Symmetry: D2
Amino acid sequence: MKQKVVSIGDINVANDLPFVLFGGMNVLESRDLAMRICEHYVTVTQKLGIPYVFKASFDKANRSSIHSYRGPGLEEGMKIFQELKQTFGVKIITDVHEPSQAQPVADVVDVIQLPAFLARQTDLVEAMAKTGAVINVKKPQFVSPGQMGNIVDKFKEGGNEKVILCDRGANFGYDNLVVDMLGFSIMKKVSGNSPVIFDVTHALQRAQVAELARAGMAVGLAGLFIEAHPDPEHAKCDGPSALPLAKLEPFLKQMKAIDDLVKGFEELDTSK
Amino acid sequence: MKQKVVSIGDINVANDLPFVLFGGMNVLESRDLAMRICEHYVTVTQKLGIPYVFKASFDKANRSSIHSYRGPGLEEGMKIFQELKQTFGVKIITDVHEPSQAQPVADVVDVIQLPAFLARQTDLVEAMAKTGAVINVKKPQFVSPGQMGNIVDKFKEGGNEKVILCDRGANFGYDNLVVDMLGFSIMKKVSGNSPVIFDVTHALQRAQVAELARAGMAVGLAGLFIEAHPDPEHAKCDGPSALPLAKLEPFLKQMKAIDDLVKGFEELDTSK
Amino acid sequence: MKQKVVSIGDINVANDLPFVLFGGMNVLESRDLAMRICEHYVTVTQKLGIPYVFKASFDKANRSSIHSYRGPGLEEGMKIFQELKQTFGVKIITDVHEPSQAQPVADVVDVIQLPAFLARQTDLVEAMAKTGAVINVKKPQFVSPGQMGNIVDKFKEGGNEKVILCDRGANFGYDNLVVDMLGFSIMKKVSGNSPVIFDVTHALQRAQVAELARAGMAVGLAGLFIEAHPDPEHAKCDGPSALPLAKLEPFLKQMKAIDDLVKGFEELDTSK
Amino acid sequence: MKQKVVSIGDINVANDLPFVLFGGMNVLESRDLAMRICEHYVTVTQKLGIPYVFKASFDKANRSSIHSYRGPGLEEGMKIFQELKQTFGVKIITDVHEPSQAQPVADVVDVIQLPAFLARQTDLVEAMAKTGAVINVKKPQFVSPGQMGNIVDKFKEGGNEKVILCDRGANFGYDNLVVDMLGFSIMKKVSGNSPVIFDVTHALQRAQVAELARAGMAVGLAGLFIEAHPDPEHAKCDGPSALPLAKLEPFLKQMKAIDDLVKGFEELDTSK
Ligand SMILES: O=C(O)[C@@]1(O)C[C@@H](O)[C@@H](O)[C@@H]([C@H](O)COP(=O)(O)O)O1
Ligand SMILES: O=C(O)[C@@]1(O)C[C@@H](O)[C@@H](O)[C@@H]([C@H](O)COP(=O)(O)O)O1
Ligand SMILES: O=C(O)[C@@]1(O)C[C@@H](O)[C@@H](O)[C@@H]([C@H](O)COP(=O)(O)O)O1
Ligand SMILES: O=C(O)[C@@]1(O)C[C@@H](O)[C@@H](O)[C@@H]([C@H](O)COP(=O)(O)O)O1
């Protein structure tokens, strides 16, 4: 039973391969900040030996109040990714919201992303399926792991067969998320063993980021999705919960130690 | 403490007023069927004395497989509502999916509707807010009743202040829904007491439709949302679960008996 | 399909019969209070025409701190029920905790009760099964409605076949309960259609008691379990949540109106 | 912030110390089997360098049908532990059900255990508190991690201050459990940092035992509770789910690798 491999350039994403890191920032506040963020990851990844795909949103459709920060915009956001690609030579992953946006971004970026709230949006899927680019399907919090087959299916049909599945927890009563560590294996199975990744920061709507990321890693995964900010405190708002830049490295040491140890275990069968 | 009233033409929707019925069919399969469905409700409502707003989808974006029935289409769907309005003189409620669709439909119909998966879609909201038409916000299964304030808010700002909230249950573990009968009062409160309605057929993803609708009604509500099909059996698929046309009346008798009895109770305070 | 009838003296408990009320107080604080409580229910029931079975605990095993009020005791509690029986001529229902207590109480009372935390306690069940007295099995919050067959089974074997099932909600995330109005029918079915009753006050760990009891009643049930206190405010603590004595009647009017209306509906089949 | 240490003989249980293993069998079917089970763990633990406390039930109160295997009995069960202690020189942990049983077992065994269904049983707690022996409080599936303070409290009062907390997952909808990897830290905090252990086999009511135990371990814990059977297949029934004896070692290698790596990480603070 070998794992499906979805490559992003010279990068090979797969469940038995060492874990890739799709780290980054939430939104593209400004390039002076993007660059500073994207500067530390690269430095840290490069130094620790971990694949990496910077991530950032150039848009935000679920914000409260219309009189709020939508974001840079598709036309001004893509421009920002350009400069980073050159200056740093790393891949960029970003999410889209409308069917049309799909192709524009596909050119500019390496891994596009499908939002959870829109996971079941056939039109936007088919249109993201056209691009042929790599996809990251965030697993909705209201959907069971064994239902991720349909999404992957609908994508094969659209001609796209390069998909990654991202988990960010499941609803646990009102206003709360719990991560079912058992969902990863269920997702690998029904997904022709596509690559599974854990969005730890979004599964925590704290000093919890670490313990929870350790647990995810010990299961053995293809990737780890995260977000950080130089100053989480003052810039705290809501949505996810970012990691403190200055703790990137010491935290990523924890992951590799795990991911490496685990990724190299003699296959076990507690089945019989 | 009086209830907010949102009128749809000569119709006054409100939590203390007698319940309105936003019944109908799931999708607009064909007019030969739409008309037959819309024929029985009208006949039954009219005969039993219950307000009514036919409902039907001219589109479907969450279907499995691209090679599937999208639906009539916006351009050919609106045409269908025209003929029904004339032939029957009843209001039409239908859902939209993209920001642009909003105005087109607003002209053609009386009550537009915001899908749950898109409840938090600011752009589509602002654009639905423009129309100024009545709105029905389906309460996502992954959102708590006391969070329906933000949606109603984002709509006031968009200039729209004619909103109804629809509940279709909450996630209960994997692949399952439970209706928190307590969510209705929580929703009335944080909603400036806007009208609350129960989507019974969508809260049941059976011979259960009735018992569950009774319970909802006994709480005292503004409306009741439902769907029926002449032959549920053979045309069964998935999504919701339709009621059997031939049982409309005897089932709606149950509701009025409840809604009427309850809607006329001396306000009670178990508070103290 | 007729309902199973479990009689408690001249009382006939059954799902299609008018609803019985197993009201009362939480614990037996003092007789000066018990009597006052038991005085108002009787007066109200008798005046409104509703069967009734006073209820009270002579013991409490889940209290915090050993240095707390256990309760009157089995030996001094039973004495209290005696005086009430005479003075008022009503039935008494109370819960037991240890295998031995079963018989003692069976003599003194009419309906014994099995605590949820102990629902799966075979020894205490078999011993409660011996008595042959009527039983009330509180449905644990961590057990699904369709699992109530085993308990009823284990009781038939013990020779006891006079059982009532009581529902007090289900776990909904951390520290929270939701009542699945659909659980009642599932419980009737797997229970040879035994009598199902709704413990509204324990399903609410407020001004919510009413709306929630209405919903339960509209489903159509055998009974309604509740608790009240003269002054809920000052004597508030935790466990359940009692109703305000002075609101008993106006609240029970709500129930009969429902229970009566519903209990006399032409059987409906939304099944086909 | 140092961890509380609860010693069981020459054994020191604590959250920062290497993990102890409280492995064993479910019930005491027969000594010819107990001994064979207890033979392999010891051999494996001893060879791998992991503390160990054989575990087995001499009783079963939640079985279906009275006409079923209760178990050896308290009087004939304790006798079995005697022979194992001598023959193998390992500690024995077993659960009690009635207040009286407490002392008898305390003499015979090292770590007694409080069942979840009885976690909130004040009498049985106070009586288990008397013994003064080490306690293992299984965390009920219907209780939140931050409520484990009360139990630990009620035990201090009873004079007992040597307690371990065991987690076996939380209710996730009907008939299902999910393990909230975040519950361990919440439990350490409100417990004066008492020792936390993960009951993996009971959190799985499969080939899942491993992945789930890895995740638990990566969080960093005091212990690991498990059960195994020579032939899980044919002797499969219900309650928990046992591990396959022949896979003990290769599975415990996985744990130590984790527990060791993790237990020796430079304290991290993703807090700021
Ligand atoms: O907190 C997050 O995980 C994140 O920042 C990561 C982004 O890559 C993206 O998935 C985003 C989110 O949900 C995208 O848009 P939405 O699903 O309509 O709110 O959340
Ligand atoms: O089963 C339903 O309740 C229904 O037929 C009613 C429609 O009015 C509409 O709310 C529809 C649904 O969810 C709209 O589209 P989607 O939320 O993206 O799947 O479901
Ligand atoms: O609040 C309650 O519903 C009540 O007062 C009713 C009593 O009849 C009894 O069921 C009691 C309870 O749980 C009995 O004891 P325990 O289950 O071990 O806490 O709760
Ligand atoms: O599957 C289990 O984890 C186990 O075998 C372990 C035993 O140590 C004990 O905790 C037992 C259980 O629940 C004790 O009795 P009960 O809580 O009344 O069913 O379950």
